[PDB]
Design a protein around this ligand. Structure first.
Ligand SMILES: O=[N+]([O-])c1ccc(O[C@H]2C=C(CO)[C@H](O)[C@H](O)[C@H]2F)c([N+](=O)[O-])c1
Ligand SMILES: [Mg+2]
Length: 535
């Protein structure tokens, strides 16, 4: 049944003592109508709100000491922290909005987006369609909020539902939470998971068409379905159909890839336009603003990057035409990246939330590419994308190195990429297909050891995650090939991370019903060791 106790009586829901029922809260500026209803292993708080709810407090309870917190987007940590020893992070002004969509919170208080967990307990919002749902630890209390970013609603709109789940099996609760999210959002969980190649983690921005063609030819000896060109081909951020260097046209690239027998894939950052791009210089009015001027969304590639205003029909028509063109060229796999830009707070043509704008953008992309195109989100708000993407990057960038000296701050490192694949495992086959980022299996031009390559690869396999390789294929020999083969034999199961609240970077992961039967891998991300059991 449902959690009952002294701790449940101590909570407040919209400022009211917690109990089951149906309630109305009329304030100066807003009205909320909500129900507190029993569900399996928990309570669901749902309802509707009108007026100017602003930063709306939904739930308040005493903070646990140890909490699993979650960043709103792909690259940000999902990790256990000590809620009482928390000190605000230094916020990088070039990357504010990767850290938080409400950075005023993160500068003062511990923040968790969408959900937070403790041993035996999960608090989780089922959707982010209009509001941004988050938790803050405020002077020793856990507070759940729905952020409406100053938008007013003349008529009722639905609250994002909040569940409070209790059971000693914390992994089970996170899986249940994720099943509910999936149902709430009509999640896409493809029956088939693509394999493939990605340029980025060998060539980076220095990819050439000449190196691409060499890899296209070698890829015929590898079990790759998709062949994906990453960042490098494009003249500027926003100018997706203008190529640079020795690259032919985007259309020509797709024709060569498909002639060679692969599904063509391509990277874009579709909600981003650089200060130097044609599209921005032609259409300065297409971006999110602040005090009526272009608002920097982030800085990357040594340029100010602006966010497209996805409330504008002109912008949506441009995006539709871009992605429709890509589809007509033969691209059927789309890595759409830096998606957080589309949800930055600021001034938009329409008075809608940044989450409402974001969802209009990704829905447009989905309509343009069609149902038989695979969409892989990256650098993306997680909950708002459920129902639209097929796959989602759920960790920071991996790297051809373990990252001994790299802090847990979203900078590239195999070690922190893999941690997130583990701690967000429960989203897989519920929200979408989890992308744990690319396997790096080459045995030159890398500092990864054989054991580190095995650890990363076999973990991803056990988790049933997407398996994409990113290497100069000339440099992948017997070991690399064997690791890929054995990885693919570990797919197909239902994984569980048995000790999700671990604080020592050691994880016990089982998966039932894989192509190799019931398997278990125990990993130590500090010593870089694993123990794998099969059958
Ligand atoms: O230093 N950074 O905060 C940062 C952030 C993101 C990032 O990777 C993204 C960019 C790109 C290309 O620009 C790749 O597609 C990655 O797979 C994607 F995860 C990288 N990166 O792998 O260079 C670096
Ligand atoms: Mg599966």
């Amino acid at each position: 049944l449902v959690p009952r106790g002294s701790h449940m009586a101590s909570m407040e829901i919209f400022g009211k003592t917690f109990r089951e029922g149906r309630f109305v809260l009329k304030e100066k500026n807003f009205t909320v109508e909500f129900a507190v209803e029993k569900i399996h292993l928990g309570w669901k708080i749902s309802g509707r709100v009108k007026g100017s709810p602003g930063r709306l407090e939904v739930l308040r309870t005493k903070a646990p000491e140890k909490v699993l917190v979650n960043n709103w987007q792909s690259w940000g940590p999902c990790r256990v922290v000590d809620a009482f020893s928390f000190k605000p992070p230094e916020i990088d002004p070039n990357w504010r909005y990767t850290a938080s969509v409400v950075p005023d919170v993160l500068e003062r208080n511990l923040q968790s987006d969408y959900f937070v967990a403790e041993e035996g307990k999960v608090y989780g919002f089922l959707s982010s369609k209009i509001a941004h749902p988050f938790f803050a630890v405020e002077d020793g209390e856990l507070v759940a909020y729905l952020e409406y970013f100053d938008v007013e609603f003349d008529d009722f709109v639905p609250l994002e539902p909040l569940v409070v789940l209790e059971d000693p099996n914390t992994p089970l609760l996170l899986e249940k939470y994720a099943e509910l999210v999936g149902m709430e959002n009509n999640a896409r969980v493809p029956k088939h998971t693509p394999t493939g190649w990605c340029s980025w983690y060998h060539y980076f921005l220095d990819l050439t068409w000449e190196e691409t063609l060499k890899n296209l030819k070698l890829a015929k000896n590898f079990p790759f379905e998709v062949f994906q060109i990453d960042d490098a081909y494009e003249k500027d951020i926003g100018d997706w159909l203008v190529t640079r260097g020795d690259f032919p046209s985007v259309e020509e690239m797709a024709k060569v890839i498909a002639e060679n027998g692969f599904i063509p894939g391509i990277w874009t950052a579709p909600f981003s336009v650089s200060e130097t791009s044609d599209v921005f210089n032609e259409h300065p009015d297409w971006v999110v603003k602040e005090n009526g001027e272009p608002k920097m969304a982030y800085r990357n590639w040594n340029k100010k990057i602006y966010a497209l205003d996805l409330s504008k029909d002109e912008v949506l028509n441009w995006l539709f035409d871009l992605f429709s063109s890509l589809r007509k060229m033969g691209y059927r796999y789309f890595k759409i990246d830096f998606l957080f830009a589309g949800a930055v707070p600021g001034e938009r043509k329409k008075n809608i939330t940044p989450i409402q704008a974001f969802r209009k953008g990704i829905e447009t992309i989905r309509k343009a590419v069609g149902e038989d195109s695979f969409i892989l989100g990256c650098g993306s708000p997680l909950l708002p994308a459920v129902g639209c993407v097929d796959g989602m990057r759920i960790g920071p960038a991996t790297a051809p190195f373990w990252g001994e000296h790299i802090e847990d701050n979203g900078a590239p490192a195999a070690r922190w990429a893999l941690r997130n694949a583990i701690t967000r495992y429960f989203m897989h086959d519920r929200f979408w297909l989890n992308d744990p980022d690319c396997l790096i299996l080459r045995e030159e031009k890398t500092d990864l050891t054989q054991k580190e390559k095995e650890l990363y690869s076999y973990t991803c396999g056990v988790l049933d995650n997407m398996i994409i390789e990113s290497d100069d294929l000339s440099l992948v020999r017997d070991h690399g090939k064997k690791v890929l083969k054995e990885t693919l034999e570990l797919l197909g199961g239902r994984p569980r991370v048995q000790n999700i609240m671990s604080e020592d970077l050691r994880y016990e992961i089982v998966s039932s019903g894989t192509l190799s039967g019931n398997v278990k891998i125990v990993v130590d991300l500090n010593s870089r060791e694993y123990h794998l059991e099969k059958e």
